[PDB]
Amino acid sequence: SKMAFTLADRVTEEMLADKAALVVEVVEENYHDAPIVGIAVVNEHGRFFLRPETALADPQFVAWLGDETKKKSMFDSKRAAVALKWKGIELCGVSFDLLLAAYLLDPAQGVDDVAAAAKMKQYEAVRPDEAVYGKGAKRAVPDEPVLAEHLVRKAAAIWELERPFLDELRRNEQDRLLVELEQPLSSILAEMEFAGVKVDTKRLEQMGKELAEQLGTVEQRIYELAGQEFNINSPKQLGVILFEKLQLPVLKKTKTGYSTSADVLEKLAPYHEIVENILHYRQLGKLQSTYIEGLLKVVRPDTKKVHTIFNQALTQTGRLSSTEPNLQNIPIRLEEGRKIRQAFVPSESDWLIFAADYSQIELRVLAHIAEDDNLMEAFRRDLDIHTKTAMDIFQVSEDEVTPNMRRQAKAVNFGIVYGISDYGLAQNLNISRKEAAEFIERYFESFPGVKRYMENIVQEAKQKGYVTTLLHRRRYLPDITSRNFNVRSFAERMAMNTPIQGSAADIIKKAMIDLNARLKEERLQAHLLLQVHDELILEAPKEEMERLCRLVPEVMEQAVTLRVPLKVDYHYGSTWYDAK
DNA sequence: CGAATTCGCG
DNA sequence: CCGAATTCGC
Ligand code: NA
Ligand code: NA
């Protein structure tokens, strides 16, 4: 089968062409401070494999790596770039990233190596990474001959696949989306990950001790209320205790057995004192195992920072996801969990954390996209959207809106930006579905523009096969035509929701790029640390706070121009917690 | 090792 | 409408 290449033992001029497919291979899943196991270059002059100890010590090669006028095509350039940052080497001039290109063409493909991306264009002369490296325990770097040929075949595939991928992006009007949004974002994310977020480990350990005391006693409480010891963390054992030893009523099931989810438990609370205690235990136990212990496990003892990996090509909506640690689900809603954010601190003395977030970006996008007159006016008035929605669907004045009316209108708003559900709304408010349905319908006569939009987008998904965001991100919806009701329903919701959630994703991505540019133009030391779907988190010298208070919201509000304002709130403080 | 369950965020 | 921790059957 054998692909021919040069197994180079030193860098030559012809390897430094100003157009090349480049592979800088990091086999470790978590690429932070990870080995680079080999390098492949394919250009007009040939195909090359270089050992990294040689390549990365060659001044000419390193200068080439960092020369922006030397264009590279790659796959997961962020992976390579971060790995090089940790070695003090800058990667530049990446003009095409095959992973991001695949992602934009079809985020449902699940492309996670060069092979998977190559298959989209009938190119199969490259092996899947799994086949070469193995899976799980037996994952391993193979001897040099196998390694080098694998990396050269990936480089060769990248070299061949650029043009067909760019052609399709162009036909999709997604060329600018790749070149001007996702790829520049990828460098910014690479900076963010490398910078990391400093963690006060002493505070976490302290909070851990406080948890363990409480846990230890709630645990003991549960045992005497059950008159038995058992694993409270096993939903099956818990199910036996609750529903068999303590003959509690079964109000919901899982397919494996009894449901012990928190929504059920709340309903069981009037029956036995053990239910509130299990609930506490769950709350405290979640914080202990995931946010205390989980977090301390991934803080790097060298930097005392956590270095997340943002997955830029994973979600079907265009959102990022965040791993090891996941910094997009740090507690905020309940106070004792919110206290976790006290452990996230600036990375230097007399710096502060700065957080800015969009207020209701999704509903604002819906207003713009549906051109709903009522919804648009509400935001031009900067109304409380939940109170307005309560006024409208209950046909009452502002003074007549009760907290509970507001809470239900809130829930409809939540559900509306996730494509109603009829039944799902019912679950959230525990009402009946007929009840839930006529809230939904009362919504649609308050907002005929949104109704019209929901109907229009569903027909469009049917006729085209996909739906589109503001900046031309795509999601294919094959199930929109399915004869199975449930399946067809999910697809319909996605058709409604994806232009909403996806356009919000577009906007905050552009904002990140606009921000990064402005900060550098202003020569500020401030830099991005994290993004949480609708929220940007920075750190900077305390001396830069007042400028940032104007700069960051301006950038975020002006990222796109919609038929309604975008509104951004901001706070800063000594810790992430205090930035509220 | 991997399906299932629960819960955290948006 | 994402990811981490845990359990459990294998
Ligand atoms: Na040569
Ligand atoms: Na890479």
Task: Give the integer Cα–Cα distance in Å for A365 and A261.
Answer: 33
Task: Give the integer Cα–Cα distance in Å for A132 and A460.
Answer: 43
Task: Give the integer Cα–Cα distance in Å for A75 and A469.
Answer: 24
Separation in Å: C6 C1' and A289 CA:
10
CATH superfamily of A361-504: 5' to 3' exonuclease, C-terminal subdomain (1.10.150.20)
Task: Give the integer Cα–Cα distance in Å for A312 and A539.
Answer: 22
Please check whether residue A257 is in contact with residue A236, taking contact to mean a CB–CB distance below 8 angstroms: yes
Task: Give the integer Cα–Cα distance in Å for A420 and A342.
Answer: 36
To the question of whether residue A531 is assigned a binding role by annotation, the answer is: no
> Nearest nt to A323, CA vs C1'?
C3
Which residue has the least CA–C1' distance to nucleotide C4?
Answer: A290
Q: In what order do the strands lie in the sheet with A71-74?
A: A6-7, A46-50, A38-43, A19-25, A71-74, A94-97
CATH code for the part of the protein at A310-360+505-579: 3.30.70.370
Task: Give the integer Cα–Cα distance in Å for A325 and A291.
Answer: 9
Experimental method reported for this structure: X-ray
Which residue has the least CA–C1' distance to nucleotide C6?
Answer: A233
* Number of residues in chain A: 580
Beta carbons within 8 Å of A428's beta carbon, 6+ residues apart: A411, A414, A415
- CA-wise closest residue to A13 among A61, A78, A66: A61
> Nearest nt to A418, CA vs C1'?
C1
Resolution (A): 2.2
Q: Which fold has domain A1-194?
A: Nucleotidyltransferase; domain 5 (3.30.420)
Q: Does domain A195-309 have CATH number 1.10.1130.10?
A: no
Domain definitions of chain A by residue range: 1-194, 195-309, 310-360+505-579, 361-504
- Residue A314 sits at the vertex; the CA angle it makes with A313 and A320, to the nearest 5 degrees, is 80
Q: In what order do the strands lie in the sheet with A351-358?
A: A527-531, A535-541, A351-358, A568-573
To the question of whether residue A406 is assigned a binding role by annotation, the answer is: yes
Separation in Å: C6 C1' and A239 CA:
15
Please check whether residue A207 is in contact with residue A316, taking contact to mean a CB–CB distance below 8 angstroms: no
What is the SS3 string spanning A47-74?
Answer: EEEECHHHHCCCHHHHHHHHCCCCEEEE
- According to DSSP, the residues that pair with A475 across neighbouring strands are A467
Which residue has the least CA–C1' distance to nucleotide B1?
Answer: A136
